[PDB]
RNA sequence: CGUCGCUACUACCGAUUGGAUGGUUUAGUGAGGCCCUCGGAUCGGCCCCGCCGGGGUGCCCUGGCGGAGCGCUG
RNA sequence: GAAGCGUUUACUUUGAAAAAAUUAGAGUGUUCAAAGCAGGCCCGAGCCGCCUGGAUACCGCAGCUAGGAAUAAUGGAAUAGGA
RNA sequence: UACCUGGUUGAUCCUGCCAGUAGCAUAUGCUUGUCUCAAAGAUUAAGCCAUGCAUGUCUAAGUACGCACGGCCGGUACAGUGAAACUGCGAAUGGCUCAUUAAAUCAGUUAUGGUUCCUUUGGUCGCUCGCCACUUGGAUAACUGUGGUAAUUCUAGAGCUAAUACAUGCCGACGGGCGCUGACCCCCUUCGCGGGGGGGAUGCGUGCAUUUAUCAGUGGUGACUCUAGAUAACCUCGGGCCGAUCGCACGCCCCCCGUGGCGGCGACGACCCAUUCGAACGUCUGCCCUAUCAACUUUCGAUGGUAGUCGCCGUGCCUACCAUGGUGACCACGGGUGACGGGGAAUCAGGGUUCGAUUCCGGAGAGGGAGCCUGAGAAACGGCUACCACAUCCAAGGAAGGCAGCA
RNA sequence: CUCUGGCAUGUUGGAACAAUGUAGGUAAGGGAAGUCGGCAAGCCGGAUCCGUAACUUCGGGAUAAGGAUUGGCUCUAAGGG
């Protein structure tokens, strides 16, 4: 059972989870379902513990702090590319968008550009 | 939940009525607003047909009209003094459709001086000089001054009303429906209606 | 039920649709539109049981999608659009024009009309009222509303309306001695002249109408729809001229027609 | 007594009493106007309601009720309620098997406006259907006719 | 014609404050939803303003780390 | 052509509106019928298509409308508070 | 087709029942060659259910950076087909059953001048003077990657990315006009005063929708406390509208120029009005058996008044204060029904007597109750929550149920 | 429980706090298994609002049985001369 923020008790409780709370996706509009969730305090009786580093140390963890994975795909909105690339106005906005290249063995190489909105 | 149906009642002859279906949504009732006096807290409840009803849990400012002067001003409610329905509603200071309340009379004083140019609500005068010395004189011309005394022969306020202007509070009756419209508009009491409610308040404690 | 009904059983369909009992269980169930579903023809029956252009429901689906059906000056792709009364069904690819008018037996009949007589349409004003800024409005027997009408038009009159503009070309006043057509009830589809309008406060008015042959009949005011100035109808009347004949004389009419054709 | 015999103040909502009575008009007595309407259907508004002082929001003439629907008559039976009376309607129910009739009655509680002061038990009253006034009241008294009387010994 | 005697069947009364199964309820407890009054695990924004900075020319246009303003507020 | 009835009803006739299906029943050789709402005319082959039907009746009681006023009930002028 | 016959007696006329006789409507028995229609787990159990299916949906026209394909034609934002997913809509229709239900349902009639209403159709969308607009902000899907769990259409953490999702927010029309406030100025009876009129600088509000109060009376009713006007104001941060949307051919203007301005056909969208489909509560009349049910209702609303609350709205629907009412031998109230109502079915002189679980209309219910989310519309159950009764899996820590749908 | 009035604890005091007693309480879990026998003790209890059966000499049974409430404080109404 996943652990939910704000439950504030070690153990499992049943909550009437509505839309967009957590640990639940509704099967239809307005559906609420009672599900079992785990409190936000950790103890011995936990399978896993998702942890996020917030700052770097002295060296690199083997297999973790190396071979950085790129963001799968760049910005799409005509303003989210300007913030990333410091576009001012009408500085060839279309071309500055990131063009993802596609390389499959059973095909010719080719790069694919996305449709930019707004 | 709370049901507004007619089939749970006894029929006219006094016999018992057996329901032929369970409760339906269109015959529902919601809990009372029980509007209080305080900082504005208005809740929105969605009603039949996707429309919106404004639950007014707390009000402090209302839109009350003089009526006899065709003067409507956005003023502040002080408290509730009388309620024809229940005496408890006054005790808990609850705003309903027809309860009479005390409202601040400053906006009506401001309009009165700026329209009639006669001291109203003042006790002895020469106390708010930086503005009142200017409103009374205005050093105005021949026609405007001639336009102000033609507003003087009809300039007169009832003794009951002017007495309340001395106290700084006017009692007025709500005309709207807090809990439905989310606002507490009303009218200022004059004439026989004002005398009737003053007698009722006096009989309550006097 | 818990909400709107969107089915119509074949047996429960209106009689003037003239549907049979064996093809299926359901009926077109016309969509919402300018006319009530009891006195409207869905396009599906009009192109399948009236003109036999389409054989099944999907065949009349293809013809509507190709956009040649043009009701009241507008192309309509709805398979179950409620046509209604005196609406111009213009199919320009075939060059035929139809004005939807009840026959003598209270049933809508195929009334082929000339192209230039399809450019206008008659309409019965139902409610007259003034809107904001003091603008007078006018709603007709259709769900069509217009602004700024001639102040002489009152309720239950007739307005001469031309298509593609929506303006009032002319109007017919409701008065004694005016040709009309009955649009509901037993006398539905009878052409005649107003003779008397008796009124009942708080209830429906009753009017008395005499036809060309002299037969006098009465009906409610809500079933009156004046289509002529005095005597001269403003529209090409269908075959039979909106005259009602009893069981005695259509029989001998068949025998005469059969004998002549035999 | 007068018209103020309760916890609230009665007044016809369409009438403004406090019409700025100043020295240009003699005070008093400026008689307040009275709201009254013709209810239609040929019924004549009684003179008592034209010029009386009573307040009745359910009165057909001086209140906010519209008569529409069925108009029917009855006989006054009891008058032991406030501003409302019960009338009895007698009719005959036909039975096909015996080809004979069967006498039946239905009591109706109707609102009686104060304009009809001269109402005893046994009179003929014509009532018109209005919106539900009470739990069992849907008709309002429109005309009162005496029951072979008009003279009392 | 009736009592009496034998045999079957049908109901009736009957201690057992008999028993069983339904229905409507008093009282007590009372899940759950909804409303109100609180509550605030968290999640943002402004005040960034220790700094390198700086431009119409220490008077910052700012490129960002960063303390965190130990507040104002959603 | 606008207004009222010099009573109020019951009664009778007329008209309106009264779902369809079912019933009675009009038309129609389903190969006959129960059914169904279809179908029929010519073609010399251009018939580059013509004529129809999908009626009508009944729908009790209650409600609405317009005529009649014989039977039945109910009233008008008696302290005249009468026309 | 308006029908009778046998049986009490030694025998006769009757009363009177029993039996016979015909139909249809359930079962059953025997038999059964053809063909056209055609009812069918209603009756007892609205008792219990394994399994499978029964509600999903994309046009050129909301959002495609899946290689899952593919035109590449090669230096370009997006060729095109498109899985997935977000979004919108539907899932409240249909189908099944008849348990409840006796002025209740339902039928005919009438009203909403006492209300709500997705959609369709037609109106309305420059009516408001008030350093992004050549287009603003943040997240989240799908997707990559790390898992947990015995198990589920269970999901967490991490990393991206869009909108007709979610928010924010202009220009423009726009020049002004109107109503108040009125600096002053001008023409004035002039005369030593009043003067009768004009302009007007400066400030305040201006539109539709809402909530009040007031004034007058362009259209409409049988009748508005109608519609429309005029004034004073309000206009709710879980807060109304005043288009930051998407395709199709592509064109005109070129003074200023030359790089902009103009353009048609649609789609989507909306505050509000009308319309359509309705829905909801009401008016009058009408229901089977029972008096070994004659007096019921009223503390706990029973009948009515006043003022409110709540509801979409009218109403004891609820609350407070009052009045003591209201219904009954013209059968109230109570009880029973092997009662869902009606259209209709059987029988057929006429009159009637039975029958309508059952294909059409209306209602009710989804194992029994109760309570809710979303939505225009549900007290929904092929939606959720809880309890009761049954019942499934489990690694015993939990999880999942509703065939009176088709089989 | 107290005031007026009265008294000195009933023909002795002091120190201890064993058994047995006399008088008075409490007792987990069970609940008459104790006993001739519920002896003794225990339960209940006032008032207000409900609600009350068989039977009956119609008077009764009846406080039948059974159930709810009860404090303090701040008020609000009604009942007079
Ligand atoms: K001792
Ligand atoms: K014992
Ligand atoms: Mg776009
Ligand atoms: Mg039953
Ligand atoms: Mg049935
Ligand atoms: Mg249901
Ligand atoms: Mg919707
Ligand atoms: Mg349910
Ligand atoms: Mg002692
Ligand atoms: Mg001593
Ligand atoms: Mg002694
Ligand atoms: Mg013990
Ligand atoms: Mg114990
Ligand atoms: Mg023993
Ligand atoms: Mg023993
Ligand atoms: Mg004892
Ligand atoms: Mg006893
Ligand atoms: Mg207390």
Curated annotation (Swiss-Prot), chain A:
Modified residues ((3R)-3-hydroxyarginine): 77
Post-translational changes noted in the entry: Ribosomal protein S6 is the major substrate of protein kinases in eukaryote ribosomes. The phosphorylation is stimulated by growth factors, tumor promoting agents, and mitogens. It is dephosphorylated at growth arrest.
Protein origin, superkingdom: Eukaryota
Subcellular location: Cytoplasm; Nucleus, Nucleolus
Residue numbers bearing the Phosphoserine modification: 88
Homology family: Belongs to the eukaryotic ribosomal protein eS6 family.
Subunit field text: Component of the small ribosomal subunit. Part of the small subunit (SSU) processome, composed of more than 70 proteins and the RNA chaperone small nucleolar RNA (snoRNA) U3.
Entry function: Component of the 40S small ribosomal subunit. Plays an important role in controlling cell growth and proliferation through the selective translation of particular classes of mRNA. Part of the small subunit (SSU) processome, first precursor of the small eukaryotic ribosomal subunit.
Protein name: Small ribosomal subunit protein eS6
Organism this protein belongs to: Homo sapiens
Lineage: Eukaryota, Metazoa, Chordata, Craniata, Vertebrata
Swiss-Prot record, chain B:
Modified residues (Phosphoserine): 159
Sites bearing Phosphothreonine, chain numbering: 129
Span of the signal peptide: none
Record field: compositional bias (Basic residues): 7-25
Entry annotated with the keyword NAD: no
N-myristoyl glycine: lipidated positions: 1
Subcellular location: Cytoplasm; Membrane; Nucleus, Nucleolus
Membrane topology term: Lipid-anchor
Region annotation Disordered: where it falls in the sequence: 1-26
Family matches, as PROSITE patterns: RIBOSOMAL_S8E
Record-level GO BP terms: cytoplasmic translation; maturation of SSU-rRNA from tricistronic rRNA transcript (SSU-rRNA, 5.8S rRNA, LSU-rRNA); ribosomal small subunit biogenesis; translation
Domain of life: Eukaryota
Glycyl lysine isopeptide (Lys-Gly) (interchain with G-Cter in SUMO2) cross-link, chain position(s): 169, 192
Protein family membership: Belongs to the eukaryotic ribosomal protein eS8 family.
Protein's name according to its UniProt entry: Small ribosomal subunit protein eS8
Taxonomic lineage of the native organism: Eukaryota, Metazoa, Chordata, Craniata, Vertebrata
Gene name of this polypeptide: RPS8
Swiss-Prot record, chain C:
rRNA-binding keyword on record: yes
Gene Ontology CC, one term: cytosolic ribosome
Keywords for this protein: Acetylation, Cytoplasm, Isopeptide bond, Nucleus, Ribonucleoprotein, Ribosomal protein, RNA-binding, rRNA-binding, Ubl conjugation
One GO term (biological process): positive regulation of cell population proliferation
Known role: Component of the small ribosomal subunit. The ribosome is a large ribonucleoprotein complex responsible for the synthesis of proteins in the cell. Part of the small subunit (SSU) processome, first precursor of the small eukaryotic ribosomal subunit. During the assembly of the SSU processome in the nucleolus, many ribosome biogenesis factors, an RNA chaperone and ribosomal proteins associate with the nascent pre-rRNA and work in concert to generate RNA folding, modifications, rearrangements and cleavage as well as targeted degradation of pre-ribosomal RNA by the RNA exosome.
Assembly and oligomerization: Component of the small ribosomal subunit. Part of the small subunit (SSU) processome, composed of more than 70 proteins and the RNA chaperone small nucleolar RNA (snoRNA) U3. Identified in a IGF2BP1-dependent mRNP granule complex containing untranslated mRNAs.
Name of the protein: Small ribosomal subunit protein eS4, X isoform
Gene behind the chain: RPS4X
UniProtKB/Swiss-Prot annotation, chain D:
Lipid attachment residues per UniProt (S-palmitoyl cysteine): 59
Positions where N-acetylalanine occurs in the chain: 1
One GO BP: ribosomal small subunit biogenesis
One term under GO cellular component: nucleoplasm
Keyword annotations: Acetylation, Citrullination, Cytoplasm, Lipoprotein, Methylation, Nucleus, Palmitate, Phosphoprotein, Ribonucleoprotein, Ribosomal protein, RNA-binding, rRNA-binding
Predominant place of localization: cytoplasm
Omega-N-methylarginine: residues carrying this PTM: 68
Pfam families in the cross-refs: Ribosomal_S17 (PF00366), Ribosomal_S17_N (PF16205)
Domain of life: Eukaryota
Claim: Cell membrane is one of the keywords in the record: no
Post-translational modification Phosphoserine, affected residues: 66, 109
Subcellular location: Cytoplasm; Nucleus, Nucleolus
Modification(s) after translation: Citrullinated by PADI4.
Functional description taken from the UniProt entry: Component of the small ribosomal subunit. The ribosome is a large ribonucleoprotein complex responsible for the synthesis of proteins in the cell. Part of the small subunit (SSU) processome, first precursor of the small eukaryotic ribosomal subunit. During the assembly of the SSU processome in the nucleolus, many ribosome biogenesis factors, an RNA chaperone and ribosomal proteins associate with the nascent pre-rRNA and work in concert to generate RNA folding, modifications, rearrangements and cleavage as well as targeted degradation of pre-ribosomal RNA by the RNA exosome.
Family that this chain belongs to: Belongs to the universal ribosomal protein uS17 family.
Subunit note: Component of the small ribosomal subunit. Part of the small subunit (SSU) processome, composed of more than 70 proteins and the RNA chaperone small nucleolar RNA (snoRNA) U3.
Protein name: Small ribosomal subunit protein uS17
Organismal lineage: Eukaryota, Metazoa, Chordata, Craniata, Vertebrata
Gene, per the UniProt record: RPS11
């Amino acid at each position: 059972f996943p652990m939910k923020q704000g439950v504030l008790t070690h153990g499992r409780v049943r909550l009437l989870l509505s839309k967009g709370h957590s640990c639940y996706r509704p099967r239809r509009t307005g559906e609420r379902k009672r599900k079992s969730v785990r409190g936000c305090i950790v103890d011995a009786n936990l399978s896993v513990l998702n942890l996020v580093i917030v700052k770097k140390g002295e060296k690199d963890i083997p297999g973790l702090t190396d071979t950085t994975v790129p963001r799968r795909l760049g910005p799409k909105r005509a303003s989210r590319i300007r913030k990333l690339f410091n576009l001012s106005k009408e500085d060839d906005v279309r071309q500055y968008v990131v063009r993802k290249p596609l390389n499959k063995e059973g095909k010719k190489p080719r790069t694919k550009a996305p449709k930019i909105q707004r | 939940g709370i049901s507004r149906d007619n089939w749970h009642k006894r029929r006219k002859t006094g016999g018992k009525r057996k329901p032929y279906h369970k409760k339906r949504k269109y015959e529902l009732g919601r809990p009372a607003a029980n509007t209080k006096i305080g900082p504005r807290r208005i809740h929105t409840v969605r009603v039949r047909g996707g429309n919106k009803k404004y639950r007014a849990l707390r009000l402090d400012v209302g839109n009350f009209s003089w009526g006899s002067e065709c003067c409507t001003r956005k003023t502040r409610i002080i408290d509730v003094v009388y309620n024809a329905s229940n005496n408890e509603l006054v005790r808990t200071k609850t705003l309903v459709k027809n309860c009479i309340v005390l409202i601040d009379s400053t906006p009506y004083r401001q309009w009165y001086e700026s329209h009639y140019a006669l001291p109203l609500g003042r006790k002895k005068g020469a106390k708010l000089t930086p503005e009142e010395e200017e409103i009374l004189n205005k050093k105005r011309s021949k026609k405007i001054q001639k336009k102000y005394d033609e507003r003087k022969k009809n300039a007169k306020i009832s003794s009951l009303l002017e007495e309340q202007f001395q106290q700084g509070k006017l009692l007025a009756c709500i005309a709207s429906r807090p809990g439905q419209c989310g606002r507490a508009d009303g009218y200022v009491l004059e004439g026989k209606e004002l005398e009737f409610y003053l007698r009722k308040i006096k009989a309550r404690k006097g | 039920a818990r909400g709107p009904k969107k089915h119509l059983k074949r047996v429960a369909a209106p009689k003037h649709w003239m549907l049979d009992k064996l093809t299926g269980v359901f009926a077109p169930r016309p969509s919402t539109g300018p006319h009530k579903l009891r006195e409207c023809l869905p396009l599906i029956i009009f192109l399948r049981n009236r003109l036999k252009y389409a054989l099944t429901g999907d065949e009349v689906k293809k013809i509507c999608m190709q956009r040649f059906i043009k009701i009241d000056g507008k192309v309509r792709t709805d398979i179950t659009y409620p046509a209604g009364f005196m609406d111009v069904i213009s199919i320009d690819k075939t060059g035929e024009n139809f004005r939807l008018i009840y026959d003598t037996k209270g049933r809508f009949a195929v009334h082929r009309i000339t192209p230039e007589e399809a450019k206008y349409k008659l309409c019965k004003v139902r409610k007259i009222f003034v809107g904001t800024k003091g603008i007078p409005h006018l709603v007709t027997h259709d769900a069509r509303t217009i602004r700024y009408p001639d102040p002489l038009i009152k309720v239950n009159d007739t307005i001469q309306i031309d298509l593609e503009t929506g303006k009032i070309t002319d109007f017919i006043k409701f008065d004694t001695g005016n040709l009309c057509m009955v649009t509901g009830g037993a006398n539905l589809g009878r052409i005649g002249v107003i003779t008397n309008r008796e009124r009942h406060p708080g209830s429906f008015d009753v009017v008395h109408v005499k036809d060309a042959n002299g037969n006098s009949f009465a009906t409610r005011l809500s079933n009156i729809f004046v289509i002529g100035k005095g005597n001269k109808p403003w529209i090409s009347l269908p075959r039979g001229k909106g005259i009602r004949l009893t069981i005695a004389e259509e029989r001998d009419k068949r025998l005469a027609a059969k004998q002549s054709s035999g | 007594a007068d018209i103020q015999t309760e916890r609230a103040y009665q007044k016809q909502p369409t009438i403004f009493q406090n019409k700025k009575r100043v020295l240009l008009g003699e005070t008093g007595k400026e008689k307040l106007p009275r709201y009254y309407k013709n209810i239609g259907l040929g019924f004549k508004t009684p003179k008592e309601a034209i010029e009386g002082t009573y307040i009745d929001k359910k009165c057909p003439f001086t209140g906010n009720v519209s008569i529409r629907g069925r108009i029917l008559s009855g006989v006054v039976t009891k008058m032991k309620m406030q501003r409302t009376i019960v009338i009895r309607r007698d009719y005959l129910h036909y039975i096909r098997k015996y080809n004979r009739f069967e006498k039946r009655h239905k009591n109706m509680s109707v609102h009686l406006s104060p304009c009809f002061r001269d109402v005893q038990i046994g009179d003929i009253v014509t009532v018109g259907e209005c919106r539900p006034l009470s739990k069992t009241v849907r008709f309002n008294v429109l005309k009162v006719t005496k029951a072979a009387g008009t003279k009392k010994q």
